[PDB]
Design an enzyme around this catalytic site. Structure first.
Site, PDB file in Angstrom:
ATOM      1  N   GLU A   1       0.835  -1.178   0.000  1.00 31.12           N
ATOM      2  CA  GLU A   1       0.000   0.000   0.000  1.00 31.12           C
ATOM      3  C   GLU A   1       0.880   1.241   0.000  1.00 31.12           C
ATOM      4  O   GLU A   1       1.999   1.238   0.530  1.00 31.12           O
ATOM      5  CB  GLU A   1      -0.963  -0.030   1.186  1.00 31.12           C
TER       6      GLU A   1
ATOM      7  N   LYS B   1       2.097   4.862   1.144  1.00 28.70           N
ATOM      8  CA  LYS B   1       2.228   5.429   2.485  1.00 28.70           C
ATOM      9  C   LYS B   1       1.792   6.886   2.432  1.00 28.70           C
ATOM     10  O   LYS B   1       2.572   7.768   2.066  1.00 28.70           O
ATOM     11  CB  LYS B   1       3.642   5.296   3.042  1.00 28.70           C
TER      12      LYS B   1
ATOM     13  N   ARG C   1      -2.747   9.867  11.186  1.00 29.98           N
ATOM     14  CA  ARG C   1      -3.558   8.684  11.459  1.00 29.98           C
ATOM     15  C   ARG C   1      -4.835   9.083  12.171  1.00 29.98           C
ATOM     16  O   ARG C   1      -4.794   9.823  13.156  1.00 29.98           O
ATOM     17  CB  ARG C   1      -2.783   7.695  12.319  1.00 29.98           C
TER      18      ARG C   1
ATOM     19  N   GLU D   1      -5.824   6.925   7.387  1.00 33.74           N
ATOM     20  CA  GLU D   1      -4.972   8.115   7.383  1.00 33.74           C
ATOM     21  C   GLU D   1      -5.713   9.260   6.713  1.00 33.74           C
ATOM     22  O   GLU D   1      -6.007   9.191   5.518  1.00 33.74           O
ATOM     23  CB  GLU D   1      -3.650   7.892   6.647  1.00 33.74           C
TER      24      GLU D   1
ATOM     25  N   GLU E   1       4.930   9.030   0.652  1.00 34.47           N
ATOM     26  CA  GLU E   1       6.287   8.797   1.143  1.00 34.47           C
ATOM     27  C   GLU E   1       6.839   7.436   0.738  1.00 34.47           C
ATOM     28  O   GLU E   1       8.028   7.163   0.955  1.00 34.47           O
ATOM     29  CB  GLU E   1       6.347   8.900   2.672  1.00 34.47           C
TER      30      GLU E   1
ATOM     31  N   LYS F   1       2.965  -5.176   4.512  1.00 27.24           N
ATOM     32  CA  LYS F   1       2.427  -5.967   5.608  1.00 27.24           C
ATOM     33  C   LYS F   1       2.040  -7.330   5.077  1.00 27.24           C
ATOM     34  O   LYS F   1       1.721  -7.477   3.891  1.00 27.24           O
ATOM     35  CB  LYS F   1       1.187  -5.318   6.221  1.00 27.24           C
TER      36      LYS F   1
ATOM     37  N   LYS G   1       7.641  -0.296   6.914  1.00 24.50           N
ATOM     38  CA  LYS G   1       7.570   0.986   6.224  1.00 24.50           C
ATOM     39  C   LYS G   1       8.782   1.075   5.316  1.00 24.50           C
ATOM     40  O   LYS G   1       9.916   1.076   5.804  1.00 24.50           O
ATOM     41  CB  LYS G   1       7.543   2.165   7.208  1.00 24.50           C
TER      42      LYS G   1
END
Ligand SMILES: Nc1ncnc2c1ncn2[C@@H]1O[C@H](COP(=O)(O)O)[C@@H](O)[C@H]1O
Length: 638
Positions: free
Chosen positions: A301, A303, A308, A356, A455, A460, A479
Site C-alpha cells: 500500500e 504510504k 492517522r 490516514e 512517502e 504488511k 515501512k
DNA sequence: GCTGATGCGTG
DNA sequence: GTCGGAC
DNA sequence: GTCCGACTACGCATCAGC
C-alpha cells in the site's frame, strides 16, 4: 518507619516487612522517591522491573487505593490519553518556581540547569519550619490540580502549587518532582517496564487478600524455569488487554477485583475506547523485504502523508475519532462525523477503522502536503469554518457489527472492509494496493507511489503473523520509503555555524547543531535546520572536541540565522557535514533561500539526520541556497 | 485587544 | 518523526 | 530485537506583559 532507608532493591524483599509505611496509611512520596533512586542507579531493565514490582507489591498489599496514582506517577502521566490532560508547565515556569522556592536569580539557576542538563538536580541542591511529609496520592493530586488551571493569571496559580511541593520535599523528593514537571523523568523505565512490573507484582502478591495476606510470595514454590515462564505468560494477558484498553482508570479497578487471569473477560476492545494502533518497522531496501518476509505473501500500500485517524462508529449512531496517541480528535473533524453514513454500508451497525486523513484540494482533485494538513483548526471546530478538505484512505478494519477482528488475519480484514464500505474519490478510498512478490513490479510501484505524492510503500503480511495483535510484535508492518536506501534521496552538504547544549544523555557536550547553506549573491551563510540525531556517541565526541577549538564569542557578520534559536556556542565556520533528509519544507522561521521560492519564507529540512563529515569540502563549497531552492521545486509540486 | 514567547501534538 | 545504545 | 531516551520541523492554542 524511617522512609529515608526504604530499599525495595533489597534482596529477598517482603511486601509487608521491608515496607516503610504501616497498612491502610497513605503511601509516602519518599517511598516513590527512594524506589526511583534504586531504579535510576542500575541499568538492567530486568533489575529495574524488580525494584518497581516490589514497591508495587507492598502498595497492592497495604494500600490498595494508592495503586493507580503510583502507576501514573511512575509513568509520569496524569490520566488516560483520551482525557487530553496536560501540565501547561514548562521550563520557564518551573525554573522560575524553583528560584521562587530557594532565592537565586532566575538567570543564575537558569545557567545551572543548562550546565547540568537537568532541572531536578538544581532544585534539590539549593539550600524554616518543615511541613508534613508528602504522600504519593497527594503529589498526584497537586499535579492534576496544576493541569486543570487555565486562563489569565493561571501560571501564577501554578507556580504556587509547585513552590508548595518543593517546600514539603525531603532528601531526593525535590529531584523527582522537578523532573516529573519538566516532562523528562528519565529513569530508564517506561510503559512496557511499568506494565511488566505491574503484572509481576500482582502475580507475586495477588490482590484482594484480607490483611494480613496469606501469600506475599506466590512465587516461592516454583522452579526458576517455571517462574520465568509463569510471569511471562501473565505478562501477555496484561499487555494485550492494555493494547486494547490502554487506559489504567478502567483496568486497575477490575484488576484489583477479579485478579489478572480473568481480566480479558471484563476489559474487551469496545467501540468508543481507543486502542493502540499497529506500528511500522523501517525496511531500508527490498533485499530486506524478502529477508524478513521470505516465505509469506504480502500486499503493498501507498504510504499516505496525512495523519492517522482511528474512526469509531459505535452501535448507537454516535461517532468518535481518535489519533495515533489515543487522543480525542472528535472535535476537529465535524466534516467526517457528518460524512459518516456515506461509507458504512446500511447493514454496518458498529465499526472501528484504521485510516490516514490526508489534505485534499477539491478544485484540483489532488493531494496537499502534510504542512497544509496541519493548518486545520484543532480542539473544537464548527462545520462551516472548515477550510482544508480532508479525504480518508482507509487501510484496516478492526471491529465490525459486534465482532473484534484483532484475532483475524489481514486478508480476512481487507475483504471485510473492502466489502462493507463505499469508495468516494475525494472523500474515501482504500489505500492503493498491489499484491505481489515481483521485484521488478515492486520498484515499479515504489517510484509509482511517490509519483502519486506519497512517502513510499507500506508492506504488511496477508496471512502469516497477519493479526492486529500489537502485543506479540508491535512493529510487525514494514515501512519502506525513498530516503532509507543508502545512495538515494536528497543529501546536502551543509555548514556548522553554531552548536547547542545537551540535556540528559547528552548532558556535558553538544546535543544539537545549527546548519547553513552558502548563499552566493549575498555572500552570506544561512541557517537551514538544526541537527541532533544520526551520529554515534564516539562521533558526537569527535565533534564536541574538534569544535572546541573553533568556539566563537560572537557571530561572524556574514552568518544570518534569523528566528532560529540563538546557539549557545557560536562557531567559526569550518566544519562541513553531509545531511540526509526526507523532504524540504517552506520554513516559517528559516532564512535559507528565502525569496527564491516565496515572498517571506525560507526552506528547512524535514527529518534532518547526520550522515558523515565532509572534510574535503570547504565552507564555500557546501550546498548553495540556489541549489536548495532547486530540490524543493523538483518535489511533487502541483 | 494585541504580540511575542512557548507548550504540545501531529509527523 | 529519526536515530543509537545498553541490555 | 526490545525498550528507552537523545534529537528534529511545523503550526494551532494559550497567556504575561504591555
Ligand atoms: N497504508 C498505510 N498503512 C499503514 N500506515 C499508514 C498508511 N498510510 C499512512 N500511514 C501512516 O503511517 C504511519 C507509520 O509511519 P511511521 O511509523 O514510519 C501510521 O501511523 C499511519 O499514520
Amino acid at each position: 518507619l524511617d522512609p529515608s532507608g526504604y530499599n525495595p532493591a533489597k534482596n529477598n524483599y517482603h511486601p509487608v516487612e521491608d515496607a516503610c509505611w504501616k497498612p491502610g496509611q497513605k503511601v509516602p512520596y519518599l517511598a516513590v522517591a527512594r524506589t526511583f533512586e534504586k531504579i535510576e542507579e542500575v541499568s538492567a531493565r530486568l533489575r529495574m522491573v524488580e525494584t518497581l514490582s516490589n514497591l508495587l507489591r507492598s502498595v497492592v498489599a497495604l494500600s490498595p487505593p494508592d495503586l493507580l496514582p503510583v502507576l501514573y506517577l511512575s509513568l509520569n502521566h496524569l490520566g488516560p490519553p483520551q482525557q487530553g490532560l496536560a501540565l501547561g508547565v514548562g521550563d520557564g515556569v518551573l525554573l522560575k518556581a524553583v528560584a521562587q522556592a530557594t532565592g537565586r536569580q532566575l538567570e543564575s539557576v537558569r545557567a545551572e540547569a543548562a550546565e547540568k542538563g537537568d532541572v531536578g538536580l538544581v532544585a534539590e541542591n539549593s539550600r524554616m519550619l518543615p511541613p508534613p511529609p508528602l504522600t504519593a496520592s497527594g503529589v498526584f493530586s497537586k499535579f492534576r490540580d496544576i493541569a486543570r488551571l487555565t486562563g489569565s493569571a493561571s501560571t501564577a496559580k501554578k507556580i504556587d502549587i509547585i513552590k508548595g511541593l518543593f517546600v514539603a520535599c525531603r532528601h531526593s523528593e525535590a529531584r523527582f518532582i522537578a523532573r516529573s514537571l519538566s516532562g523528562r523523568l528519565r529513569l530508564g523505565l517506561a510503559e512496557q517496564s511499568v506494565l511488566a512490573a505491574l503484572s509481576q507484582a500482582v502475580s507475586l502478591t495477588p490482590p484482594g487478600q484480607e490483611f494480613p495476606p496469606a501469600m506475599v510470595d506466590a512465587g516461592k514454590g516454583k522452579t526458576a524455569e517455571a517462574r520465568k515462564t509463569w510471569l511471562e505468560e501473565q505478562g501477555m494477558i496484561l499487555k494485550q488487554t492494555f493494547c486494547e484498553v490502554p487506559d489504567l482508570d478502567r483496568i486497575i479497578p477490575v484488576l484489583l477485583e477479579h485478579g489478572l487471569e480473568r481480566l480479558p473477560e471484563h476489559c474487551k476492545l469496545s467501540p468508543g475506547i481507543p486502542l493502540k494502533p499497529m506500528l511500522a518497522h523501517p525496511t531500508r531496501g527490498i533485499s530486506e523485504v524478502l529477508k524478513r518476509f521470505e516465505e509469506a505473501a504480502f500486499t503493498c500500500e501507498y504510504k499516505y502523508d496525512g495523519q492517522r485517524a482511528q474512526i469509531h462508529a459505535l452501535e448507537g449512531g454516535e461517532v468518535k475519532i481518535f489519533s495515533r496517541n489515543q487522543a480525542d480528535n472528535t472535535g476537529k473533524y465535524p466534516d467526517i462525523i457528518s460524512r459518516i453514513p456515506k461509507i458504512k454500508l446500511p447493514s454496518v451497525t458498529s465499526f472501528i477503522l484504521d485510516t490516514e486523513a490526508v489534505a485534499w484540494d477539491r478544485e484540483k482533485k489532488q493531494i496537499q502536503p502534510f504542512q497544509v494538513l496541519t493548518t486545520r483548526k484543532r480542539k473544537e471546530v464548527d462545520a462551516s469554518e472548515i477550510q482544508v478538505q480532508v479525504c480518508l484512505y482507509a487501510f484496516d478494519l478492526i471491529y465490525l457489527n459486534g465482532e473484534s477482528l484483532v484475532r483475524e488475519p489481514l486478508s480476512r480484514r481487507r475483504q471485510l472492509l473492502r466489502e462493507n464500505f463505499v469508495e468516494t474519490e475525494g472523500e474515501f478510498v482504500f489505500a492503493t494496493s498491489l499484491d505481489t512478490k515481483d521485484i521488478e513490479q515492486i520498484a515499479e510501484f515504489l517510484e509509482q507511489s511517490v509519483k502519486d505524492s506519497c512517502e513510499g510503500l507500506m508492506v504488511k503480511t496477508l496471512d502469516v503473523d497477519a493479526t492486529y495483535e500489537i502485543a506479540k510484535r508491535s512493529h510487525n508492518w514494514l515501512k519502506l520509503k525513498k530516503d532509507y536506501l543508502d545512495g538515494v534521496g536528497d543529501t546536502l552538504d551543509l555548514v556548522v555555524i553554531g552548536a547547542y547544549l545537551g540535556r540528559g544523555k547528552r548532558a556535558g557536550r553538544y546535543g544539537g547543531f545549527l546548519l547553513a547553506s552558502y548563499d552566493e549573491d549575498s555572500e552570506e551563510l544561512q541557517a537551514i535546520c538544526k541537527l541532533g540525531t544520526g551520529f554515534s556517541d564516539e562521533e558526537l565526541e569527535e565533534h564536541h572536541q574538534s569544535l572546541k577549538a573553533l568556539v566563537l564569542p560572537s557571530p561572524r557578520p556574514y552568518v544570518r540565522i534569523d528566528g532560529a534559536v540563538i546557539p549557545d556556542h557560536w562557531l567559526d565556520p569550518s566544519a562541513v557535514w553531509e545531511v540526509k533528509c526526507a523532504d524540504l519544507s517552506l520554513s516559517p522561521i528559516y532564512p535559507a533561500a528565502r525569496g527564491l521560492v516565496d515572498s517571506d519564507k525560507g526552506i528547512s529540512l524535514r527529518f534532518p539526520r547526520f550522515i558523515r563529515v565532509r572534510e574535503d569540502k570547504q565552507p564555500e563549497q557546501a550546498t548553495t541556497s540556489a541549489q536548495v531552492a532547486c530540490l524543493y521545486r523538483k518535489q511533487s509540486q502541483i
